[PDB]
Design a protein around this ligand. Structure first.
Ligand SMILES: [Mg+2]
Ligand SMILES: [Mg+2]
Lengths: 50, 89, 693, 762, 99
């Protein structure tokens, strides 16, 4: 076994990748909620930090 | 499975489509952009919506969907009005 | 879970038709519930009734299959020879011999009736119901009983929908079923269309690659190339077993970070009245009638940083005490806080002074100076460990009524442990902390923005077991020194501590402290008066620190569990009551003397854990936090080596670097560092998977 | 009186403020739920600190002025201030100590009884503790880490939505929706609760909040040590943990724990009824369900609402639910064993092998639940890949081993052929071939050597050192001299998985449920218990169980005609009673059906006293609406001056006295219901019985919704009793919406209306 | 588990009210008095989330009328007083309509 801890876990992950993954999951479900899934990431793909 | 995602999404869609937007007040502190400060979600949402109301008329959505639809509608808005406090001596 | 919703209010089998219909007739997962109403609405209308003849009065067409429903609608052309309508209706009457179709709408009836009426005119009997009991119809209404039962159903269904708050979704095709699309603002569409990661720019292309994705097994080669580029460290413990021992900082010996002095601190006994003492703020006023008033220090102090200020203030305290325990100062307060403010400048006007640099404009931040391992700490621990002559300090409540089984055990264990730990000096300091920080915590509400004189006291009762009938065990409270509040900055309070002591000050550890030669105090025993020194300092108290330090009792608990567990785990093996036996017999490694590893029984090595937890309370700095939260990795690797589990750590240099990084100027933090060194050493000596320099 | 006025004036004031006025008008009432949510009471950053800060000041606490003014002095006894006139809210500030003073010297009497039954939950959880013995010892216990087991169990436990309905009805009437499903069916508990709590208006919010908890078993995921009864759960902490143990506990339990098991046996028989006839299994079982009536320790409740909404899911119970629309997934039943699925997947495939067979080829890992024994298995390609047992008793371990081997289905499954073709093969149930897994299953359940056979069918090897503790003997020991292959015991129990899931699908014609598009959860017939013992249980409608005599069915059905047919309108009992005319009532055509069954000898002598009582009760406020039914059928015949006492009314040699509930006629107290031997019936809509005071508002309803056209007077609910039949009236409902009704024929064919049409379409 | 003999509200600090945050809160208080008012009218409002296709004010008005009629017909309240309540209601309806 190994005890695994990750550093800078959030900094590494990217909303750009999440957009694509969300598009993959919503591929079949509905075209009425797919468009409602893709919206959440793009606001983080274009995010402003105070 | 083979419909793992399809089904999970189904459950999501269901719970959300039901949801009253008032339940959005439940949660951690979030950024109120009216006064440009941090607030408890409830009060921040209050201002957000109240502003929408004073700008373009009261909100009758009563659902997360219609809320979201109004959100996306506001980006195209060229002008927005706020409840902002200015003290005068 | 739409089935979950529908089946909960609707009829079990009635839903099955919705579910089937949704697969072919349309394709929307939610809409089942919509039609789930309409369908049921029809069945109740057409079943109980039968014609005068044997045949049933009505025949249902809606619930059936489409292609079959067509040819069955063509049967009516044979039977009654009426015009073959293009629109497939729901139900066919045989007594009335006319087309029947049912609509259900949420809004005011007219809105939807005008629609369906536009569709089929007077050609069919069209009946439109609102959930609320609003009614709209063609010429003739259904029979008086079926009206009643259908409306009764619709109203209840409505209330179930409102309880689940599903309303706008339910509307009929022309009104809202059409507008189920997600709103598409150009702003959004653009943002989206340039938010995409791939070489593809249009969202649509990204969509296609996602939806039409089927990944081949090239990730094996992608992973091996990733691996070659990785050069990831396959580490072994035997190889890095040294851990370069542990790195420790070099400089000035660390100082006394604790807000109060422990070991050297001196006490002043007073036998308390229940009604005099109750004030707790009058304790000192009644003390001053005693010898305390006599004590005055000389202007010329040992090891002192700001003599005259502290001397004056002492006089201001003493004078205040006579009248009232408040310092009548408006201006001396401001300085004493300062020992400062920084006047501010607008950027707007500042642009000229940048152009014309004056007042020597610059920007810098500062860091704390590293210190070295303390020596005095060991002596402090050794002093806190041993029992004081005074019996008990921490106010503990009464014990609850007991049943034989469990309570006898708990009650016994507690009474014994409390008995041991109340006698200790560690407990003393816990007591004074709690009582005094409590006193300040009151004073912040009582007189904010005011200067007040608060005592540093602890309460104890003396216990005498000479086996003689004494007057009583002595009930009293003793004093350590005087304290001064200053409200400033909400934020951190500024505090000024004055403690009596009988011991000669040490420059190396008391650097923050400013010492005086106060006088001479009497000390005695029988089976001699020693000079009195006054230690003074200033410190910062966060309200948070006030709170957590006030509730010091918590330390007892974390010891308790730690202690208790050992006794159960042990006894649980032999399935016997070994608590009493384990406490006295089980040996815990406590220290080293004359180069030889020492151990004490669990009952006295209990004191060690307690002290250790008390220090954890006092000496808590973000440094310490980081220390422990990285130290755990060390401990786990250690026991990994103990039970020969052949461990490994990926970047020990990096770990030791973080450990080093969090070691700045924290006496405890460093102490534990050095003690972990000695651990690693003696452990390396027992079984060798470590280093010794 | 001004209490209602000042509220109106406030409304005037608020609606004058245009800002508040518009938000008050736009939208539904549901907005209140949102509006309230736009107010946190205060900042919650530093809890313990804030409170320590709060009580520090002498006068901070908010308090009630008026009541204290009314009952007690505001000034002090030790001359420390207690009261002021300084204030924004109507509530005026006061010191902490005062509260303690009124507790001491305040004048109050007789509240004790009122309290406890409000918190029968908490108070009972005390009561239970009194009755138990104690013992003490220690051990390295191996507890059972994860059971989703009911804690704080109470009789008549129910779902959240329905309990909310109860909450509404009991607390107040003024604003309550006329909710049908729960009220019609579960009435009686409604009576009890509403009766004890409506009369004495105290703590309106609180009581509600605690009733919600009073019927809510907190089914948390907890570590137990073998005592799985929902009663030991409440106080596990004192009983044990990993190194603690206590004794003498099983005894005192609430009457619920055994009652659930009784319902399991009920479902057993109800399923045997559908088993008997295989013409259809779908349309018949549903009937046996909805018909059957349960009698709880203090309440009559339908079988439907018990089944649909029971917590515990047994192999039977699964089947019972399957008929209805009740989603209770995550449950897998196979014979007496219970299973859970945790890994992978695969398809059902057909494979004929010499002794057609259904085999699964999944690398699937599942959990095994059997009495006193738990285990973990994994199958791949129709054979057990990995196995480990965490059982307690050796026998039960062996049983586990076996059952799971059956489900596993190796090649050795086919090799063992003692008989089967003779009996096990074909099941004597209208010539139905029973499924094969269950066949070998039953073959093993037959005899003792049948277990030994397949136990030996597995590979046996002398296990290696290092597997001494793990190895399993044939007899079920840990000796390891000889042991089974692909199996190892575990020194301790095995944890149970849990999933928050709901799945439901129709059942096949042979009591099979292919739920989740397969999975064979239904296990056919779990246990062939050919027994018929029942206590205080009701059944009905050609039940295929003979409890119905000819004379008793005559009496009972004769009564049922009258009771049931009367209520709808004019020329039925209600209208007749309202008119005070009791002749039409005598001459009723349904009484004539009952006439010929009476004893001829005293026919007039009976009718005499009967016609007497009915007439004496005609004056209002004195009639017992139950008695009337009991007395009426004998009145038809011409009253002869018998002068001989007519207490015992021989209806074909069986007597029916007034009051004096007996075999033929059970006159229940304090609720509307009546038993006729092993059967029960009741009518809801028109009972004003003198005893039914508390729910004379609830019970009177047989009304329904029509249209809103008539400007029918807005009557209050209590005014609803007066408006006669065929009368369209207006009323306020629930939390806003106002609708209109008339005296209706009750809602009918909620289920059947659809079900028959659906059958017709095919 | 909650026991009922002592239940009291902790007074909010005089910190949020002094700043401009109160000038904003002037809206939130307008929500409050309304919520308090409706709860005074409907008892179970907090317990059961109010439902039905009605406005808050409309339900308030009609329910007040029902309680007034109830108290009048059988209970102990005067007739001219009931008419005075009816007057207050309708007068309130005017101001409500104007908005
Ligand atoms: Mg149609
Ligand atoms: Mg239609």
């Amino acid at each position: 076994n190994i005890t695994g801890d990750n550093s800078k876990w959030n900094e590494c992950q990217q909303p750009e990748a999440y957009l694509a993954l969300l598009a993959y999951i919503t591929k079949d479900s509905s075209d009425l909620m797919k468009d409602l899934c893709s919206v959440a990431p793009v606001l983080f793909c274009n995010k402003f930090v105070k | 499975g083979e419909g793992f995602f399809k089904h999970c999404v189904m459950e999501a869609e269901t719970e959300i489509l039901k949801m009253h937007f008032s339940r959005l007040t439940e949660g951690r502190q979030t950024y109120d952009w009216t006064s440009e400060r941090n607030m408890p979600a409830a009060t921040a949402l209050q201002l957000t919506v109240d502003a929408i109301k004073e700008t373009e008329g009261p909100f009758k959505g009563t659902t997360m969907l219609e809320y979201c639809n109004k959100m996306i509608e506001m980006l195209d808005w060229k002008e927005i009005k706020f409840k902002k406090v200015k003290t005068v001596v | 879970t739409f089935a979950e919703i529908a089946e909960a209010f609707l009829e079990p089998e009635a839903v099955r038709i919705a579910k089937e219909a949704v697969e072919e007739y349309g394709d929307h997962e939610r809409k089942i519930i919509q039609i789930g109403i309409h369908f049921q609405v029809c069945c109740m209308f057409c079943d109980e009734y039968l014609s005068t003849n044997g045949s049933d009065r009505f025949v249902l067409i809606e619930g059936r299959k489409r292609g079959t429903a067509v040819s069955l609608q063509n049967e009516l052309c044979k039977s009654y020879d009426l015009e073959p309508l293009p629109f497939l209706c729901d139900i066919f009457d045989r007594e009335e011999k006319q087309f029947v179709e049912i609509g259900i709408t949420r809004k005011a009836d007219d809105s939807y009736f005008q629609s369906k009426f536009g569709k089929l005119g007077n050609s069919c009997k069209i009946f439109v119901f609102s959930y609320d009991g609003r009614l709209d119809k063609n010429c003739e209404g259904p029979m008086e009983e079926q009206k009643l039962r259908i409306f009764s159903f619709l109203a209840t269904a409505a209330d179930f929908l409102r309880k689940e708050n599903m309303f706008n979704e339910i509307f009929l095709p022309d009104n809202e079923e059409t507008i189920i699309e997600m709103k598409k603002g150009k702003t959004f569409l653009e943002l989206r269309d340039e938010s995409v990661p791939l070489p593809f720019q249009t969202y649509e292309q990204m969509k296609d690659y996602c939806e039409k994705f089927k990944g081949n097994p090239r990730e094996l080669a992608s992973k091996v190339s990733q691996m070659q580029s990785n050069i990831k460290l396959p580490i072994k413990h035997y190889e890095q077993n040294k851990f370069r021992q542990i790195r420790l900082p070099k400089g000035p010996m660390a100082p006394y970070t604790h807000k109060f002095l422990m070991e050297e601190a001196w006490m002043f006994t007073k036998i308390s009245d229940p009604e005099r003492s109750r004030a707790g703020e009058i304790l000192i006023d009644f003390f001053k009638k005693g010898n305390l008033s006599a004590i005055r220090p000389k202007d010329k102090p040992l090891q002192g940083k700001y003599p005259i200020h502290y001397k004056n203030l002492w006089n201001q305290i003493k004078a205040a005490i006579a009248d009232r325990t408040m310092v009548i100062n408006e201006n001396d307060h401001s300085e004493f806080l300062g020992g400062r403010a920084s006047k501010k400048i607008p950027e707007i006007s500042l642009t000229q002074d940048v152009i014309t640099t004056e007042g020597l404009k610059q920007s810098e931040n500062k860091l704390p100076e590293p210190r070295s391992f303390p020596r005095w700490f060991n002596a402090e621990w050794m002093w806190a460990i041993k029992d004081s002559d005074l019996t008990g300090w921490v106010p503990m409540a009464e014990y609850p009524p007991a049943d034989n089984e469990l309570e006898d055990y708990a009650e016994h264990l507690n009474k014994t442990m409390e008995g041991v730990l109340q006698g200790t000096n560690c407990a003393r300091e816990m007591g004074k902390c709690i009582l005094t920080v409590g006193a300040l915590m009151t004073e912040c509400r009582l007189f904010p923005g005011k200067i007040k004189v608060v005592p540093i006291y602890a309460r104890s009762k003396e216990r005498k077991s000479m086996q003689e009938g004494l007057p009583v065990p002595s009930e009293m409270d003793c004093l350590f020194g005087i304290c001064v509040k200053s409200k400033s900055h909400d934020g951190m309070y500024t505090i000024i501590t004055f403690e009596f002591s009988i011991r000669e000050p040490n420059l190396e550890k008391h650097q923050k402290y400013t010492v005086f030669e106060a006088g001479h105090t009497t000390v005695r025993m029988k089976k001699r008066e020693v000079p009195l020194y006054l230690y003074c300092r200033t410190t910062a108290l966060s309200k948070i620190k006030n709170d957590w330090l006030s509730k010091a009792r918590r330390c007892f608990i974390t010891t308790m569990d730690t202690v208790e567990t050992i006794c159960l785990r042990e006894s649980a093996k032999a399935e016997e009551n070994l608590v009493e036996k384990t406490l006295n017999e089980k040996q815990m490694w406590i220290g080293k003397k004359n180069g030889e590893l020492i151990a004490q029984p669990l009952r006295e090595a209990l004191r060690v854990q307690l002290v250790q937890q008390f220090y954890f309370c006092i000496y808590n700095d973000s440094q310490l936090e980081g220390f422990c939260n990285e130290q755990k990795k060390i401990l786990m690797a250690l026991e990994g080596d103990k039970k020969n589990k052949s461990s490994f750590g990926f970047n020990p240099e990096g770990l030791l670097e973080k450990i080093e990084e969090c070691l700045i100027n924290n006496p405890m933090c460093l102490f534990m560092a050095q003690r972990l060194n000695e651990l690693v050493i003696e452990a390396s000596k027992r079984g060798a998977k470590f280093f010794k320099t | 009186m001004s209490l209602l006025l000042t509220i109106a004036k406030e409304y005037k004031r608020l609606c004058q403020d245009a800002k508040a006025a518009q938000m008050m008008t736009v939208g539904t009432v549901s907005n209140y739920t949102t509006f309230k949510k736009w107010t946190t009471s205060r900042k919650e950053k530093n809890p313990s600190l804030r409170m320590r800060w709060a009580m520090s000041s002498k006068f901070p606490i908010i308090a009630n002025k008026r009541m204290l003014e009314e009952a007690q002095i505001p000034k002090e006894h030790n001359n420390v201030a207690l009261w002021e006139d300084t204030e924004k809210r109507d509530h005026v500030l006061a010191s902490a100590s005062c509260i303690n003073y009124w507790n001491f010297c305040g004048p109050c009497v007789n509240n004790s009884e009122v309290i406890k039954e409000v918190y029968k939950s908490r108070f009972g959880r005390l009561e239970r503790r009194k009755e138990i013995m104690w013992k003490e010892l220690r051990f390295t216990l191996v507890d059972r880490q994860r059971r989703r087991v009911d804690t704080q169990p109470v009789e008549q436990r129910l779902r959240t939505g329905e309990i909310k309905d109860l909450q509404m009805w009991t607390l107040f009437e003024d604003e309550a929706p006329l909710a049908s499903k729960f009220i019609l069916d579960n009435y009686g508990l409604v009576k009890e609760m509403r009766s004890k709590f409506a009369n004495k208006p105290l703590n309106k919010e609180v009581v509600a909040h605690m009733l919600e908890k009073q019927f809510n078993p907190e089914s948390r995921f907890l570590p137990v040590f073998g005592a799985i009864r929902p009663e030991r759960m409440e106080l596990i902490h004192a009983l044990g943990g990993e190194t603690w143990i206590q004794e003498a506990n099983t005894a005192g339990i609430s009457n619920v724990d055994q009652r659930k098991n009784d319902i399991r046996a009920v479902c057993r028989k109800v399923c045997l009824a559908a088993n008997a006839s295989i013409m259809n299994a779908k349309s018949k079982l549903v009937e046996y369900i909805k018909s059957t009536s349960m009698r709880i320790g203090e309440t009559e409740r339908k079988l439907e609402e018990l089944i649909l909404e029971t917590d515990d899911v047994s192999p039977e119970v699964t089947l019972c639910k399957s008929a209805l629309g009740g989603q209770l997934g995550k449950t897998l039943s196979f014979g007496p064993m219970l299973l859970k699925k945790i890994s992978g997947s695969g398809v059902k495939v057909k494979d004929t092998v010499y002794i057609q067979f259904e085999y699964w080829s999944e690398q699937e890992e599942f959990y095994g639940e059997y009495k006193s024994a738990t285990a973990l298995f994994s199958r791949k390609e129709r054979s057990l890949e990995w196995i480990t047992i965490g059982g307690g008793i050796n026998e039960d371990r062996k049983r586990l081993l076996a059952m799971c081997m059956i489900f596993c289905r190796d090649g050795d499954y086919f090799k063992d052929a003692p008989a089967t073709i003779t009996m096990a093969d074909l099941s004597t149930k209208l010539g139905r071939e029973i499924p094969y897994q269950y066949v070998m299953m039953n073959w093993i359940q037959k005899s003792e050597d049948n277990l030994e056979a397949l136990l030996y069918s597995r590979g046996i090897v002398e296990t290696n050192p290092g597997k001494m503790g793990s190895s399993m003997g044939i007899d079920g020991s840990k000796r390891a001299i000889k042991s089974l292959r692909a199996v190892t015991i575990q020194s301790g129990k095995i944890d149970m998985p849990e999933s928050k899931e709901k799945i439901h699908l129709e059942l096949s014609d042979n009591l099979e449920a292919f739920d989740s598009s397969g999975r064979i959860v239904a296990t056919i017939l779990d246990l062939p218990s050919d027994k018929k013992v029942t206590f205080q249980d009701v059944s009905f409608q050609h039940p295929d169980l003979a409890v119905l005599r000819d004379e008793k069915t005559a009496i009972t059905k004769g009564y049922e005609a009258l009771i049931k047919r009367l209520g709808t309108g004019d020329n039925d009992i209600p209208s007749l009673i309202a008119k005070k005319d009791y002749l039409s009532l005598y001459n009723l055509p349904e009484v004539k059906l009952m006439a010929p069954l009476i004893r001829p000898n005293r026919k007039g002598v009976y009718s005499r006293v009967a016609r007497k009582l009915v007439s004496t009760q005609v004056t209002t406020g004195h009639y017992s609406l139950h008695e009337l039914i009991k007395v009426l059928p004998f009145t038809y015949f011409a009253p002869k001056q018998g002068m001989f006492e007519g207490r015992l009314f021989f209806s074909n040699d069986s007597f029916v006295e007034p009051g004096v509930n007996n075999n033929v006629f059970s006159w229940s107290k304090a609720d509307s219901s009546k038993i006729y031997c092993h059967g029960i019936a009741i009518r809801v809509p028109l009972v004003v019985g003198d005893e039914h005071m508390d729910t004379s508002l609830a019970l009177l309803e047989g009304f329904s919704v029509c249209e809103n056209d008539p400007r029918a007077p807005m009557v209050t609910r209590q005014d609803l009793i007066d408006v006669g039949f065929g009368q369209k009236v207006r009323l306020f409902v629930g939390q806003g919406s106002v609708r209109t009704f008339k005296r209706t024929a009750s809602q009918r064919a909620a289920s059947s209306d659809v079900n028959k049409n659906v059958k017709k379409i095919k | 588990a909650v026991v009922s003999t002592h239940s009291f509200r902790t007074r909010a600090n005089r910190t949020l009210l002094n700043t401009d945050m109160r000038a904003m809160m002037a809206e939130e208080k307008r929500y409050q008095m309304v919520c308090d008012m409706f709860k005074s009218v409907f008892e179970s409002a907090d317990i059961n989330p109010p439902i039905g296709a009605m406005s808050i004010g409309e339900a308030i008005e009609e329910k007040l009328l029902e309680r007034a009629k109830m108290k009048r017909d059988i209970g102990a309240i005067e007739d001219s007083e009931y008419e005075e309540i009816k007057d207050i209601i309708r007068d309130a309806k005017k101001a409500r309509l104007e908005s």
